[PDB]
Symmetry: C3
Subunit: 30 residues, 3 copies
Amino acid sequence: RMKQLEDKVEELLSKAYHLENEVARLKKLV
Amino acid sequence: RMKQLEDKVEELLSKYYHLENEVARLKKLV
Amino acid sequence: RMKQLEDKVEELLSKAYHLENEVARLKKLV
Ligand code: NA
Ligand code: NA
Ligand code: NA
Ligand code: NA
Ligand code: NA
Ligand code: NA
Ligand code: NA
């Protein structure tokens, strides 16, 4: 149950921090 | 347990919407 | 609350993926 969705939320957290940076890239160059 | 998960998924739910706006805005700006 | 949680991160993982795609698209327009 919960160790499965925690590692998903972990994955989610990583992704969010990833995309956040990407958007910063785009915005500073666009 | 389930407290911290719903906690973080709201962080994530809002992060993800926030990004969707940045992407929408950025699409207009290219 | 457990099942709603697991399905909520479902949407998140899937929106995470389309943001990667839409931010990848915007990369070579800027
Ligand atoms: Na996996
Ligand atoms: Na509550
Ligand atoms: Na936090
Ligand atoms: Na969207
Ligand atoms: Na996924
Ligand atoms: Na992935
Ligand atoms: Na790049």
